[PDB]
Amino acid sequence: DHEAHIKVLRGEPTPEEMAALMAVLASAGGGPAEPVKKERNMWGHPVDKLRYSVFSWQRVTLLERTHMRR
Amino acid sequence: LYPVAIPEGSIEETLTDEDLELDTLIPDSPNQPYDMHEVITRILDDDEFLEVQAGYAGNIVVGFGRVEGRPVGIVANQPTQFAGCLDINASEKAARFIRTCDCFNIPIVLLVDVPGFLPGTDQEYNGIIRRGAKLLYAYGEATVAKVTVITRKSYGGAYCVMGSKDMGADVVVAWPTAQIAVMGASGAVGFVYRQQLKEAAKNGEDVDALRLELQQTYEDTLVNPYIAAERGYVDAVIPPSHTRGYVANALRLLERKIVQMPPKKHGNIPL
Amino acid sequence: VTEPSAEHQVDIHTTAGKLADLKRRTEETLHPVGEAAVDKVHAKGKLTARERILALLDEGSFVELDALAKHRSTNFGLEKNRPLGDGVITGYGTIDGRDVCIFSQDATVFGGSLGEVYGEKIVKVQELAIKTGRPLIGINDGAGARIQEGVVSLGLYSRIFHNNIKASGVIPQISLIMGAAAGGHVYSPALTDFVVMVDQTSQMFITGPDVIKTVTGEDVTMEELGGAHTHMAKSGTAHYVASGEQDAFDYVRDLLSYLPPNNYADPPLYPVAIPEGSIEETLTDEDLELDTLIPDSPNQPYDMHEVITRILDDDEFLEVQAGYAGNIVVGFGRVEGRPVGIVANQPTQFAGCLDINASEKAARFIRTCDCFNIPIVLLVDVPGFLPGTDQEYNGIIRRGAKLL
Amino acid sequence: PIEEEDTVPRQTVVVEVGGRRLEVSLPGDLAIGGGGGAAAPGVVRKKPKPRKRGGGGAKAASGDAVTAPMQGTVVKVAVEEGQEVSAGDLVVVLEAMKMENPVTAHKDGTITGLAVEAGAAITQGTVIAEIK
Amino acid sequence: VPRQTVVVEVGGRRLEVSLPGDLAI
Amino acid sequence: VPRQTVVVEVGGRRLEVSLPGDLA
Amino acid sequence: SPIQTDLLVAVRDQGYMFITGPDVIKDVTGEDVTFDELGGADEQAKRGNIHKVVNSEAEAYQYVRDYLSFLPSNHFDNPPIVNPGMEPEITPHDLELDSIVPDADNMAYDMHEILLRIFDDGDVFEIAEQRGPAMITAFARVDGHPVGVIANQPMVLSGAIDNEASDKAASFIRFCDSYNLPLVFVVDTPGAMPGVAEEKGGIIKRGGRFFNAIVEADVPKVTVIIRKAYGGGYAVMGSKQLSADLNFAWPTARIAVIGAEGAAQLLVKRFPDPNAPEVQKIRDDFIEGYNLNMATPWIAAERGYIDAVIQPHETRLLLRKSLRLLRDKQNGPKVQRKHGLLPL
Amino acid sequence: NKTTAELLAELREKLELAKEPGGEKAVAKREKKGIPSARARINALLDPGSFIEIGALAKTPGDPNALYGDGVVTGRGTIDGRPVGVFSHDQTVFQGSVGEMFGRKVARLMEWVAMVGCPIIGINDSAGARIQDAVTSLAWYAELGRRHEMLRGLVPEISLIFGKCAGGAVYSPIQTDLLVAVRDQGYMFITGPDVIKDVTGEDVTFDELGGADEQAKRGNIHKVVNSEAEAYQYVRDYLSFLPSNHFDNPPIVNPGMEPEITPHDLELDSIVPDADNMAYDMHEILLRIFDDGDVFEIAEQRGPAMITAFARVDGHPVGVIANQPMVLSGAIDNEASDKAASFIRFCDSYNLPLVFVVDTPGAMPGVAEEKGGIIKRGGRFFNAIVEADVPKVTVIIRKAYGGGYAVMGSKQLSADLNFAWPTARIAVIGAEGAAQLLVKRFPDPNAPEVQKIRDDFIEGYNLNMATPWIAAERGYIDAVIQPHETRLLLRKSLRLLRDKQNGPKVQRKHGLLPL
Ligand SMILES: CCC(=O)SCCNC(=O)CCNC(=O)[C@H](O)C(C)(C)COP(=O)(O)OP(=O)(O)OC[C@H]1O[C@@H](n2cnc3c(N)ncnc32)[C@H](O)[C@@H]1OP(=O)(O)O
Ligand SMILES: *C(=O)CCCC[C@@H]1SC[C@@H]2NC(=O)N[C@@H]21
Ligand SMILES: *C(=O)CCCC[C@@H]1SC[C@@H]2NC(=O)N[C@@H]21
Secondary structure (H helix, E strand, C coil): CCCCCCCEEECCCCHHHHHHHHHHHHHHCCCCCCCCCCCCCCCCCHHHHHHHCCCEEEHHHHHHHHHCCC | CCCCCCCCCCCCCCCCCHHHHHHCCCCCCCCCCCCCHHHHHHCCCCCCEEEEEEECCCCCCEEEEEECCEEEEEEECCCCHHHHEECHHHHHHHHHHHHHCCCCCCEEEEEEEECEEEECCCHHCCCHHHHHHHHHHHHHHHCCCCEEEEEEEEHHHHHHHHHCHCCCEEEEEECCCCCEEEECCCHHCCCCCCHHHHHHHHCCCHHHHHHHHHHHHHHHCCEEEEHHHHCCCCCCCCHHHHHHHHHHHHHHCCCCCCCCCCCECCCCCCC | CCCCCCCCCCCCCCCHHHHHHHHHHHCCCCCCCCCCHHHHHHHHHEEEHHHHHHHHHCCCCEECCCCCCCCCHHHHHHHCCCCCCHHHEEEEECCEEEEEEEEECCCCCCCEEEEHHHHHCCCHHCCCCHHHHHEEEEEEEECCCCHCCCHHHHHHHHHHHHHHHHHHCCCCCCEEEEEEEEEHHHHHHHHCCEEEEEEECCCEEEEHHHHHHHHHCCCCCHHHHHHHHHHHHCCCCCCCEECHHHHHHHHHHHHHHHHHCCCCCCCCCCCCCCCCCCCCCCHHHHHHCCCHHHHCCCCCCCCCCHHHHCCCHHHHCEECCCCCCCCCEEEEEEECCEEEEEECCCCCCCCEEEHHHHHHHHHHHHHHHHHHHEEEEEEEECCCCCHHHHHHHHCCHHHCCCCC | CCCCCHHCCEEEEEEEEEEEEECCCCCCCCCCCCCCCCCCCCCCCCCCCCCCCHHHHHHHCCCEEECCCCCCEEECCCCCCCEECCCCCCEEEEECCCEEEEEEEECCEEEEECCCCCCCCEEECCEEECCC | CCCCEEEEEECCCEEEEEEECCCCC | CCCEEEEEEEEEEEEEECCCCCCC | HHHHCCEEEEEECCCHHHCCCCCHHHHHHHCCCCHHHEEHHHHHHHCCEEEEECCHHHHHHHHHEEEEEEEECCCCCCCEEEEEEEEECCCCCCCCHHHCCCCCCCCCCHHHHHHHCCCCCCCEEECCCCCCCCEEEEEECCCCCEEEEECCCCCCCCCCCCHHHHHHHHHHHHHHHHHCCEEEEEEEEECCCCCCCHHHHHHHHHHHHHHHHCCCCCCCCCEEEEEEEEEHHHHHHHCCCHCCCCCEEECCCCCEECHHHHHHHHHHCCCCCCCCCCHHHHHHHHHHHHHHHHEHHHHHHHHCCCCCCCCHHHHHHHHHHHHCCCCCCCCCCEEECCCCCCCC | CCHHHHHHHHHHHHHHHCCCCCHHHHHHHHHCCCCCCCCHHHHCCCCCCCEEEEECCCCCCCCCCCCCCEEEEEEEEEEEEEEEEEEECCCCHHHEEEHHHHHHHHHHHHHHHHHHHCCEEEECCCCCEECCCCHHHHHHHHHHHHHHHCCCCCCCEEEECCCEEEHHHHHHHHHCCCEEEEECCEEEEECCCCHHHHEEECCCCCCCCHHHHHHHHCCCEEEEEHHHHHHHHHHHHHHHHCCCCCCCCCCCCCCCCCCCCCHHHHHHHHCEEEEEECCCHHHHCCCCCCCCCCCCECCCCCCCEEEEEEEECEEEEEEEECCCCCHHHHCCCCHHHHHHHHHHHHHHHHCCEEEEEEEECCEECCHHHHHHHHHHHHHHHHHHHHHCCCCCCEEEEEEECCCHHHHCCCCCCCCCEEEEEECCCCCCHHHHHHHHHHHCCCCCCCHHHHHHHHHHHHHHHHCCCEHHHHHHCCCCCEEECCCCHHHHHHHHHHHHCCCCCCCCCCCCCCCCCCH
């Protein structure tokens, strides 16, 4: 029972106004309802387009890190 | 790289007569120009010097040479043209030369005698700012060995442009005749002593004498290589004859600089 | 002994007293040279350096750094006057929810000229921006180097320029000009990616009109020499000329909205509805107008903004260098929420012919877009290069190869 | 925020439904109907911990210091350095809001390093003495 | 921003639900 | 899809509200 | 094998560690020793071989769960984000920090009073509590993101950095760097503990290791100075000169090479007549001036050694802002090589 | 304006002045104490005439009374014709304390060394706080401490303690790779005896609180010499075994001597004592298994039961970690473990193959060792040996018991090639230890029954368990070799392992030591 509920802090609507309000709010709600897991596609990632010095620490902290983050 | 038999000993012990000529090269009067090819040929091997764009923007000389068999790129101010002032054409010429040398791993030696930028509405309208930033960018971007020899003058933004220590110069040396300052003594006095000059104007004193006295004091106190030397912007104030030795040592040691920039696809040099 | 409320200061040997001391110092940083100078700025009609930062950033997001800095020079009696902050306000904040690092120069402190501590603070924020991979915004008003300090100022300028070069193409750099930027203050903006000048109240010049008069004999005012219009129309240095400071801030916010925080992060994509169907099936009335846009005779011009607006989202198009080289139009837009860079020939100016200025303008715009992973769309109506001996003598070949 | 749900951000809006003015609070992750976008790839909600140090069972885990439980003034000191005291013995009395609060020894041992004197203002967490 | 309004009918009545224009939900 | 039950607090009292699950 | 791991949790009176048993020690060296004296859980915790001591295996399990809750699964992954966005505005708990530092210097206080208030909640998970009790190394969360807190504990031995504290801080910093936890330093310390035993125990080399670790770490580093920051303590507790990213000081801060007292004796060793009356007044006046002019936050503030002197109640939200700015920090020019060398 | 000749003459006189910034007043004190100048020390260290000074004319900004150099001489030169950077404290200027330009010069030198990839040597005698600007001294202590990280593992760092290092002065030397101190002249401590007396009341002398030998025994100093000339020679010898930086190759010295078995090799067949309890000098083996008697020892005094040294196999530098039975039975104690771990990490960083010479009973039992931290030091030694990427060759002489066996280049801990002399003994524990474990079961030491049982058990154990043969059968060692084969066998093995690539390894920020 530990979830955030909608609160009507002020006002005492009757069942009809409550129903209208909830219907409108549900209609307003949207966006990604139950989206699939976002597909990984590292092809042509910006990090791969950079010039790295042969001894650059960013070869570890930026390039390898980006390729390995999962 | 050509094989060269380096003489042993210290720079003092290995000075040559051609090196000693540099001691007296610079004119006594700061208003009198000199040919910078004299310095270039006296520090380069066998006096050979392949000049690039000789007939263009004569106020700066760029070319190729060898120091102890190592190819090097010379960028030098030319006092005989526009008093060595940097302008749009000179900035672009030197910028692309420096970028070519950096592309192909050729170290650069700068010879500095520059009073500033060439004043002019035409320069401002043609873009001395945008197009003079190209030289700044090229020099700062270069990762090859970078040596600076200041002969007489390095003032203001021209000082920053022409191989300043904080712009990445690996070695910076100054001849005794060097003059490193924010600007010339006349403008400096006319600004830092506005208060006293206006008091003299109020009291009727000879401002045309007080100004010259203050300008002399300013020149004797600050227009010299020693303030930069104190701050560490000049690695050493050397006799002119030591120039080749210092340059050769620096280039021998700085074959492979372990330096880097942040990763990028490429730069965004002003165009 | 008891004290009247005016004279009393809480005992400094207590925690409450120390908090009170910090409050006093912080209040002093608001008007480092007195309230008279702030009133003079407002009467002149400008914003203070602090007001500029607070107006540009999101409300309540500014964190200031080195607020209590003082200069340590002793030359020519400078030690008698050490305003807090030493003439530059530096810190970080947010613009439209995204972090940025910012500095703003204060023209009321030694004319806004750069000293050692001044430059050190700017270097600190530059290093922070490069390190964090966040955009850097500089607001430039100052009279070049602080002459009393000597060559240390040149050292700090060199450090600042080197930092700009290091950041070039790594993080967005935007330079606002809101006053007279003289001497060395011009070069850093020249190295940054974008330049926004205010129409009548901002100038950039290396050498002043006095020196120009002395050396060349030319008489010129600061506005003529380095005004916003001069650097837009003539030198091609300014990317935008604002009617005012708020307008300049608006342009900077719009610019940032199209750019990523750095050269390896993803761009600021907007969510849009994609109409389902074939490209033939999803035509609109606005799209149909392009079928009649082009005139019948090949000699007749047309405005290419018509195509640009009809292909970009919501007809919104942020132009860059609008008043420079009108024969080519470059700017930012969105196609289905994706930021894009438009480069287009303009038939109404010089028949759309390429020339030196158009080549350089389009070339640098393209290189900025590529540095920050923004795709480019080219609208082509071009008959050739603008004939003329001046073009050849000024380097149409060399300077046109830049766009190539 | 005390409970798990108190941690969810909320936005309060004014809604008129048939004229009636209602003042509705909406969570930042409301999955009403098909609405989603809740949480983030790695966001977890949990009961927050009170800004207090543990509890009585660890009154002083190898801790000799006696710390003032509240800001106030030391109006009495009932011990002297080198005095042996037992658990529950009065150590000091702090006046806060013009009310007296006794601070007592939590463990058996010798009073060492007594740091306060009568009339000294004391902040919460200040070490009054170490019992060794 | 101007308030948004929606017209609804519940049973035998017509209601208007007025919400802030920038309701994010 | 099935119906869904939201819980709404109106002045402190709990109130269930069942809605179609297809609203969006 | 256990000593190679990152966290050792021993059950009291049930877990022991030792290379050699007491009977063999008796046979060889003749000395007599018990299990508790040799390798008891509490003794090993004090020595720094054990990170945690618990009373039961269930408690050990819960400690493990809590410990993992702050960490990612590996060097590459992200850690859990817990309760982001709480209390986005100044609260009375924040305002309590404005009067938490005792007025009189040399008055010890509990650093947990500050630690429990400058982070998301009271969830400050301490590690290696018994080792070098003058230093607190813990996990916390700033806006839901885990961070590693290194703080001084004035309640214990004046908060001086001793041998065990130095080693604990060094190991903790390296671990936090390996797992990408931003580091937060909370500074109240006079520096190294002076003494012959401290000298003989390796104070120099351990301080060197702490220097090395702080500079090596690539993660964001934010420092907040609460009162004393003297000498080596200032340098090691996330000073801007050792590559700290953002540095803040409360107005109670005191940044100096040495404390006022120590400088006073350094002055008094000249004309050394401690029996004279005048020298006492000279010391008192010198101390007053030193604490008014030298051991303050103002010299560092005006030189830029610290980014800002802040009001104490700003700490929590300021840390949020700073760490959000530093999310994607990329450490500056570093030469990739086999590994670095640290003093050992 | 002055003429060009006048400016040049002015410069010459200014440089001659800057060579002695402190003037006659300070020169007199220095010559009374009878200690050479900073430039004299640098010129004695470097090759004749190779010194180029950087920042000889640096001064404190805006200070009318500043003196050139600000208390340090920084520059570059060559040692044996190979580039090096050098700095030296000058106690005639502001007592050699750390000022702003002091710090800036040293920092720029450190950056130059990191850029060119060459070793750096610092001659330290005084770097105390500047009483005028002690806050500046603190800030620059921190700055230099930061810049050591650039160099850690990249280029060799050497410190020459020619004076009393105190306070914040100790933080830079301790970061370096080698510390050589002059015996009755160089000290190192955080706090002085007077301050210690004031705060804690203890009475202690300098020698007790950080003399050269005391610090060498504690491990803070790698070498103690009698004179600065000896210090310089030690530095030259030390650098002759190392490359200029992490990437370059080291010098190859006298490759290919004696390619066939020699009488010196044949002396090794009878070098180990017949009895097990006899100690011997491991140098009798180290002086015969490498190219020549050039075994260059480092930290001789720290752990005397362990020998860390440089040597050469076929002209190629190698690190040598050996047990010293002559001292404390060759048992590995706390200092021995740390010395080995530090040496292993250094040799791995500079690509020197590691040779282990094993004769040890293992960890030293004792409550003192337990409290001193034997467990973590053994852990650090494990971690280092396994982290190292360089070739690893092991030769077991007599004893490899327990943790000693495991850690002294065991095949299980990633060693590449393992060899054992026929005198080798590989077991968990020694015969005496096992016999004690067995006998303690019987009620009493009932002689002669108990003694007979122990003797039989020990005989059987030494004939069957503590031998090379079980390890040889199971493959734990590559071969049991006659002692005289060792030198050329090492040549062959290291020449095979020249281009070793270590993997699979997962690149990451770094590993973690026990610490
Ligand atoms: C790289 C080397 C360089 O850049 S050399 C520096 C360039 N010199 C300049 O001063 C640039 C041009 N300066 C000017 O003529 C004016 O200051 C400009 C910039 C046009 C502004 O004019 P206006 O707004 O009327 O101010 P103002 O000059 O009347 O008074 C400004 C106050 O600040 C001072 N100030 C100005 N520039 C500097 C400077 N570079 N260094 C030190 N102080 C400077 C002025 O003296 C004046 O101070 P005060 O308020 O009179 O006490
Ligand atoms: C004399 O003091 C002032 C006139 C000369 C100024 C010269 S002109 C060329 C250089 N560029 C500049 O701005 N000043 C220098
Ligand atoms: C017509 O073909 C001849 C005159 C116009 C030529 C035009 S002008 C602009 C274009 N550039 C070029 O070279 N030819 C085109």
